[PDB]
Amino acid sequence: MNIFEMLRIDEGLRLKIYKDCEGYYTIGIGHLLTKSPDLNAAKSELDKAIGRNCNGVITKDEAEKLFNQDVDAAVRGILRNAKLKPVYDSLDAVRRCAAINEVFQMGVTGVAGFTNVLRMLQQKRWDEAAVNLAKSRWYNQCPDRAKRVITTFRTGTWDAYK
Numbered sequence: 001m002n003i004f005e006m007l008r009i010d011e012g013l014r015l016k017i018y019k020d021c022e023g024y025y026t027i028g029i030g031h032l033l034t035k036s037p038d039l040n041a042a043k044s045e046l047d048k049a050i051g052r053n054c055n056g057v058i059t060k061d062e063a064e065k066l067f068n069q070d071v072d073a074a075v076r077g078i079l080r081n082a083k084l085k086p087v088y089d090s091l092d093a094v095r096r097c098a099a100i101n102e103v104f105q106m107g108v109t110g111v112a113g114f115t116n117v118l119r120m121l122q123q124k125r126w127d128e129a130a131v132n133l134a135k136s137r138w139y140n141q142c143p144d145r146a147k148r149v150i151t152t153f154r155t156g157t158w159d160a161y162k
């Protein structure tokens, strides 16, 4: 078990644009195209991402390419954020996976605004962080995509993905 397998389980796989649980246009393994309400703007972004006219459908290999780029951008987003980095660095290996996963789903901005949970995590207060994450708009809207990640922040084991 590792971040990629953890993410494939949580994001599954679509090979054509859909609306995710927050209502935004997505494809592959949780790849957000745009927050625009315009499907055609989400289409330009996709072609722009692949390097061809798709027009809204991709292959598996191309999905894994996007996936690999997006994991990388999530990690880089954490390391570049002054609020996220010190918290990230104090976490153990498995909770670091739960942190990459959350940034991958929610994006850095939303995550960095959980000042509450951020302090709790750094002080290693797992139960309270867990409780406070299960309160966000992210959890209430995306409970299947989110549940295993909260449980993982709580336990620091992979048991939720087993």
Ligand SMILES: Cc1ccc(C)cc1
Residues within 6 Å of the ligand: 078, 084, 085, 087, 088, 098, 099, 100, 102, 103, 111, 114, 117, 118, 121, 133
């Ligand atoms: C790096 C990080 C990711 C997610 C949370 C909720 C906190 C820190």
Ligand SMILES: [Cl-]
Residues within 6 Å of the ligand: 021, 141, 142, 143, 144, 145, 146
């Ligand atoms: Cl969901």
